[PDB]
Ligand SMILES: COc1ccc(C[C@H](C)CN)c2cc(C(=N)N)sc12
Ligand SMILES: COc1ccc(C[C@H](C)CN)c2cc(C(=N)N)sc12
Ligand SMILES: [Mg+2]
Ligand SMILES: [Mg+2]
Ligand SMILES: [Mg+2]
């Protein structure tokens with residue numbers, strides 16, 4: 001590991017600096033180094049890890065979608081043959097995206113999830129596992145596509161089961177999990193009705209629990225509730 | 237060269253795809269590969285090269301400025317000592333930026349400039365040489381700082397001398413060169429009066445030549461004239 | 473695209 | 478920062 005010689009605290013400090021500089025690849029490398037120190041991650045550290053990789057993979061996904069659109073148009077009827085280059089470059093970006101997902105899933109499997117006992121850590125990591133299998137599913141086409149989809153579903157489901165037993169309905173991790181599992185249902189599993197039902201039930205159960213919260217917790221929870229509503233508006 | 241096995245035309249095609257996907261590091265790598273084929277670059281190809289590297293180095297410069305600001309505050313009176321990490325990470329970004337500049341300057345010296353005989357290619361490449369020495373100067377502190385500054389000045393000056401003899405005052409390459417040399421004077425050479433004089437004379441001489449242009453050339457030239465005016469407004 | 477966090 | 482192209 002290229003970060004093996006750097007102190008854990010220095011990796012965390014540099015991850016925060018990289019974030020301020022909008023250097024998300026560096027941020028992710030620093031946080032991978034911090035995970036590989038072998039100690040459990042605090043709440044803030046978990047979110048630094050997720051922010052870094054979400055920004056990296058988000059850029060890869062956006063690029064993949066641009067290239068995939070161009071490739072689809074290059075294969076339509078009447079289009080001029082432009083050679084293998086669009087497919088090759090889409091494949092290059094896809095392979096890099098898959099590599100980032102495999103890296104994140106590898107950190108979760110070695111050994112973040114198995115050491116995560118509290119709901120706030122375990123649900124967070126299982127949500128991440130579902131998210132990164134979902135990103136793999138977005139690009140999957142081979143014999144393993146159904147197994148990739150089911151790996152995402154299985155991780156999200158375990159996270160959901162824990163979250164419903166151990167967290168209040170307004171907990172922002174629980175809300176974000178439900179938001180993302182709902183999107184999985186809509187965009188990956190071809191289950192729009194399940195996506196809409198989950199988003200609506202999550203929103204309504206959170207609404208009923210807002211009265212228990214402080215001002216700052218209310219802001220955290222209502223932010224994610226608005227995303228659930230945004231998706232429901234898009235889908236209905 | 238990792239691109240040595242790819243056709244020149246395929247590298248150019250992939251550079252254009254990378255641009256559409258906002259994958260500027262890939263774009264720059266493809267265009268470096270195309271340059272290393274050894275053939276001269278067409279006008280469009282020259283601009284693909286410059287767009288790619290400008291976006292890469294621009295992100296590095298923005299990150300360096302964020303980190304340098306944080307470092308300056310970490311050394312002010314009364315600030316809490318936070319260790320070597322801010323300096324180390326600023327140095328890491330700086331070294332990567334210098335590496336990109338050295339790569340671009342290397343392409344210009346081997347062998348783009350020596351084969352560039354027409355004004356539109358030679359002025360373009362000499363402007364680039366001045367630009368990338370200017371980026372080196374922005375971060376320079378050692379024994380070579382004055383020589384780095386003078387290398388930028390010398391390249392810009394040769395480009396200016398050619399541009400004034402061989403190009404109309406509205407030529408967008410000539411305008412952009414003057415814009416950037418003016419910024420060099422203001423921000424690098426501590427010569428604000430020279431910067432203002434150059435921007436004003438360039439603007440006024442272009443204004444007087446607009447009557448000769450088509451609609452599309454007028455739009456190209458007035459876009460850069462507005463940047464000269466923007467800088468003059470900032471500086472006066 | 474729909475919102476995720 | 479000032480404009481460059
Ligand atoms: C739920 O996400 C967070 C919770 C709390 C913090 C703050 C920390 C406790 C001290 N202020 C935090 C920082 C983040 C970042 N740098 N992106 S995410 C995040
Ligand atoms: C002066 O800059 C350009 C001039 C002409 C083109 C277009 C080409 C001739 C066919 N349309 C061009 C494309 C660019 C890019 N992809 N960023 S820069 C640039
Ligand atoms: Mg230690
Ligand atoms: Mg259910
Ligand atoms: Mg060939």
Ligand SMILES: [Mg+2]
Pocket residue numbers: none
């Ligand atoms: Mg002069």
